[PDB]
Every structure is written in C-alpha cells, then in structure tokens.
C-alpha cells in the first residue's frame, strides 16, 4: 500500500554555516558555575551543514536519503507543521530491523519493527472544511509491519512574529538511542540566529539496533499534489572535546570546541576563557608515519618437504618413518594451497594462523593406510592397529595431512 513518487527532482545538496549551535548536556548531572571538559560526540563549531529546503527551480520539493553515520544533528525552522517524523535504519527495508519515530497528531509513536517501507515514504495531511485543524489522513510509510518490539508511546514532542526553531540531536550508543531537543522562537527567516543554547536530554530509549542511513518524513500539501516549505538542516557529529561553562542556574551558557582553532585549543588547555598576553604550550606537533614497512629476514634453506611428499618409496606402516625437521623455515603455505591432498586436519591451531606459530622440532611421520583407517587417528585410539601398532598418544595431537594415491 505504498506509492512510488518518481517525480522527485534530484540536484546536488546545498550547504550553509552551522555557527556554534549544537551543544547538548553530556550527562544527567547538575553542575553549577564551573568549567567542565568532556569528550563525547558533538557538532564542531562553525562547520558546514547541509541545509535541505523545498525550494524551486519545477518546485524543488526535497526529501532525500541521508546516511545516519555516527549520529545526526537535525534542526528545522518551521511555521506550518510540515517536517513530521523520522526513519532510521541501515538498509531501510524489511530485511533489517528499522526505526520509525512518528510525531503524529496528539501523539508520538516510536516503533522498532520489521517494516516494508515505501520507495518514497512520508505522511500526508489533508485539510477538511469542517475542521480548521488538518486531519492526519495519509499514513504511507510502510507497506507492511511485523515483529514489532519496544512500541513506545509518550507525550508528543512539544510544539512551540516568531518561527519555532526546533533542534534535535539523535545518537545511538551501545544500544541506547538518545534524543535531545530544544525549541526557540526565532526571527531570522531561514537560518540559525546568532546566539547559543543547549538541548535537554528528554529521553534515552533502549533501542538495541544499528543505524547507518536515515530519512525525514515530511508533510505534503494536497490542494498527486505536493508542497512543503520551511527547511531542515543536517550535520554530522564527530568525536571532540568540549569545554562548557555551567552557570549558577545549571544552564550551559557557552562551550568551546577544543579542536576548532589554536585559540580554542588554548582555552581548552588552560580550562579558562580569558587568556593573558603571552606564549602558552598547548599540544605536541608529531608527524605521522606515512606508511609501515614490515621486513623479515631473507629466505634461507627450506625444510625439505618436497622430498618426503614426493618421495618415490614409502616405508611400511609397521616401520613408519619419523623424520626430524629443524633449523629451517617452514613454509606450509604452499603445501596447504596445493589441492592434491585429500584432507588437511590440524588440531588446536588452525592452518590459517600457523604462519606466526614457531616450533622447536617437528617429526614428520609418513606412511600409507586405508581411508577407513583415518578414523583410527585419535588420542589413545582403540583398535587392533591402534593398540598393537603405532598408537597416537592420549595427549594433544598435531596435524594430519592425507591424499589418495590409488593410481
């Protein structure tokens, strides 16, 4: 029950500044009149954010697919209740568990279920002449839903001469999906007003899935007919160190990104804001290794295994030959790669990781048996041959390598 809207017009993404907004309370602890250094995921100051606007040239209605990466800072400037909902998921299909956060009318429904999404999912509000409030009418986000878990319903994320700039931060740490937000009336028509504020923690849902790609649900005006307006900014969080000055009221009033520029790194080092005249020592300029070279001693005499596997004659099993091999480099790679051998059964250490394995002696025992007698190779194996003949000790066993030689 999904609709494919192939009419979307695709263009290279626009860009804008982020200034200094994007700071959120790192932990649910009250701090007062203190400078605190934290190391968490943040939006770097004065970074490039990808402003997505339902503009025009062919009305540019915009609802692209944006990778989730390692958390997302979203910010919408709205007046007409358009940008409503979000979708999170690594493949955005019915094969991988997915997240749907719908801020529908009178409610917010957060679901983690196996959804079969639309190729172009969204929601659709249709006006009714009877009711001034628009009726949430079209709900076309998944074609089917099954295996629902953690169906969470709470009070809806509150809706605030002013545009209600709403800022959200979405994080997913160790199976906890943290949602941060703050609403502020603003004047600036399209972008963040010069100023600073911090987002409250609200809720931290226990959602135990992986997210790498995501989508924005939007409202479309049907006068199919489409419209939108307003605008949604997206920025990508990175590991950073931030210095935050908690005031007397416990509200974060300012923060400093410790890697923005040398001045900010200085302030981050002195744990203060006003720096006196003069030189300071901040960090260490250490060049990085361009590459790594691993060198191993020149190939020397090999262990002569080409004279025992390809030997013309093989001794009788009652007088099995056991040759000592030592003082040579053991290149088992070629013999393991050769497919002429019937099997390759090494115990304890897998053949893929014996290259780094080093040994103090090896005894190569060579004989001929039957295929049904291979099952007689066991620690303290039972049977006439295994008892009155060559017996494998009950201790740990080495490796067995066999091939059929009927011809």
């Amino acid at each position: 029950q999904c609709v494919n809207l192939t009419t979307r017009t695709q263009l290279p993404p626009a860009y804008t500044n982020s200034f200094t907004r994007g700071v959120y309370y790192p932990d649910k602890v009250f701090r007062s009149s203190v400078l605190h250094s934290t190391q968490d995921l943040f939006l770097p100051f004065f970074s490039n954010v990808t402003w997505f606007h339902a503009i025009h040239v062919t009305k540019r209605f915009d609802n692209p697919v944006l990778p989730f990466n390692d958390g997302v800072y979203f910010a919408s400037t709205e007046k007409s209740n358009i940008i409503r909902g979000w979708i999170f998921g690594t493949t955005l299909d019915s094969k991988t568990q997915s997240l749907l956060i719908v801020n529908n009318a009178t409610n917010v429904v957060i679901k983690v279920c196996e959804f079969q999404f639309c190729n172009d999912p969204f929601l659709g509000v249709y006006y009714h002449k009877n009711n001034k409030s628009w009726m949430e009418s079209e709900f076309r986000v998944y074609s089917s839903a099954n295996n629902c878990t953690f169906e969470y319903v709470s009070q809806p994320f509150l809706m605030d001469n002013f545009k209600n700039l709403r800022e959200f931060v979405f994080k997913n740490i160790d199976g906890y999906f943290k949602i941060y937000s703050k609403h502020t009336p603003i004047n600036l028509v399209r972008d963040l007003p010069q100023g600073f504020s911090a987002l409250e923690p609200l809720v931290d849902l226990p959602i135990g899935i992986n997210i790498t790609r995501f989508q924005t649900l939007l409202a479309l005006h049907r006068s199919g007919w489409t419209a939108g307006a307003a605008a949604y900014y997206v920025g990508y969080l990175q590991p950073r160190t931030f210095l935050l000055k908690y005031n007397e009221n416990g509200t974060i009033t300012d923060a400093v990104d410790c890697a923005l520029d040398p001045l900010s790194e200085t302030k981050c080092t002195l744990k203060s804001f006003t720096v006196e005249k003069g030189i300071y020592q901040t960090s260490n300029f250490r060049v990085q290794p361009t590459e790594s070279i691993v060198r191993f001693p020149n190939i020397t005499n090999l262990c002569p295994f080409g004279e025992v596997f390809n030997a013309t004659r093989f001794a009788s099993v009652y007088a099995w030959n056991r040759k000592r091999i030592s003082n040579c480099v053991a290149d088992y790679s070629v013999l393991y790669n050769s497919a002429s051998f019937s099997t390759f059964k090494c115990y304890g250490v897998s053949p893929t990781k014996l290259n780094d394995l080093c040994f103090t002696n090896v005894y190569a025992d060579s004989f001929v048996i039957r295929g049904d007698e291979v099952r007689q190779i066991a620690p303290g194996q039972t049977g006439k041959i295994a008892d009155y003949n060559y017996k494998l000790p009950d201790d740990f066993t080495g490796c067995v390598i066999a091939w059929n030689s009927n011809n």
Partner: antibody, heavy 121, light 108 residues
C-alpha cells in the same frame, strides 16, 4: 499569462465584515503562496498576511492583529480575505501578492493590480 | 523589526546620468536584499533578488549592489521612461520592514 485580479474592495461601515476575493489563473495557488499588502493613497507599503499551502500557518502584522483573516479556496482555487473591526485610518489600496519557493526567505512575484477599500459612515 | 532609512526621498538627474539609491538598515543583512519597481498607477515589478541575481523579464540596464549595512542600487544609463517610485525591501525578521520610498525624476 500570469494574472491575479482583485475584487470585492469598496464600501464597508466600521466593524463590518467582508470577503475580499483574489482570483487566480495561469499557475498553482498552493505550491506558490500569496501575501496581502496594502498601499494607502499617498503613503507607503505595509504587509498583512502570508499563506503557505494552507491558511493555518500564516502571520499578521502588529498593526493588523485581529482585523484581517486570510483564506484560500479549493477547486477554482482563489484567495479570500476576511475583515473585521476596521478603523478610519486604515483606508488603502490592498494587494494580493505571491512568491515562488518560500523555503529560503519569501520573495514576491505576481504583484497584482491592487484594490481600494475605504471605511466610513 | 528593522528600520529602513532609504535616501534620497527625491532626486532629479539628467538623461544618461547614474542614479544611486542608498537603502539603509540596522545590522548585517549582507546581500539578502531585493529591489522592487512601482510605476505610478501600476502594480509593483521585480528588479533584483539577493542584490546580485537578475531575473527574467527585467532589462539588463537595471543593476544593484551593496551588502552588509549599505546598498547602492545603481542605474547605468538613465532612460526617459524610468521615472517611477522605487522601494527597497528585505526579509530577516519578517518583511514588516519596509522603506519610505524614493521618487526619481529626469532632467530633459
């Protein structure tokens, strides 16, 4: 040919109620917005209202709070403006404007011909 | 809101002369400003949006410049028919911000 002609402007007594009409053709009144502005004879411009695909997400000026109410229309797809509690100093020629995108500031387009309204006994 | 000090209120300059209409504001609007043309008894017309981009249907002889707190809006070669009322308008804290207007006339 883009055209936005205005009608309904004229004589209303103080406190009267009226629906001004701004009839639209040659485009899409939805994906494009509309905006009432007014020119007083001998005076400057002053904006009144927005509209954005619907008349619920709009705005009004500090000087116009409570008097005017914008509205649209389906099918024939025209614009309406409801007036109440007019005052004598508000006589002006009103204009129903437009835009083209809205997401990234709001730049007008059609700038229609304008219609005169005067309120007196 | 923001106050717009648009000057001069009136100006007379001969044919071909350059005309610059300075449109003032309050704080760092940068280039986000547009200019509109109003003929007497006629509906307003688009001239330039974002102070730098020329749209369709506008003669190339119309030019505009300035950013931040000052704006030029400079006319290259004055034609006898350019006489109209010009308004400078913007968008930032809602276009409540309008200008008192400038009346241009031509010496002949």
């Amino acid at each position: 040919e883009v055209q936005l002609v205005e009608s309904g402007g004229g004589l209303v007594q103080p406190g009267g109620s009226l629906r001004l009409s701004c009839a639209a053709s040659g485009f899409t009144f939805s994906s494009y917005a509309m905006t009432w502005v007014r020119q007083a004879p001998g005076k400057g411009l002053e904006w009144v209202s927005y509209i954005s695909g619907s008349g619920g997400g709009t705005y009004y000026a500090d000087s116009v709070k409570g008097r005017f109410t914008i509205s649209r229309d389906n099918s024939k797809n025209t614009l309406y403006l409801q007036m109440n509690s007019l005052r004598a100093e508000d006589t002006a020629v009103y204009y129903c404007a437009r835009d083209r995108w809205a997401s990234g500031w709001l730049a007008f387009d059609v700038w229609g011909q304008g219609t005169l309204v005067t309120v007196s006994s | 809101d923001i106050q717009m000090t648009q000057s001069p209120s009136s100006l007379s300059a001969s044919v071909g002369d350059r005309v610059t209409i300075t449109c003032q504001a309050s704080q760092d609007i940068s280039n986000y400003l547009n200019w509109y043309q109003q003929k007497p008894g006629k509906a307003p017309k688009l001239l330039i949006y974002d102070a730098s981009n020329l749209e369709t249907g506008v003669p190339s002889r119309f030019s505009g410049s300035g950013s931040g707190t000052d704006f030029t809006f400079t006319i290259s070669s004055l034609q006898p028919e350019d006489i109209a009322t010009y308004y400078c308008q913007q968008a930032y804290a809602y276009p409540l911000t309008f200008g008192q207007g400038t009346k241009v006339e031509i010496k002949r």
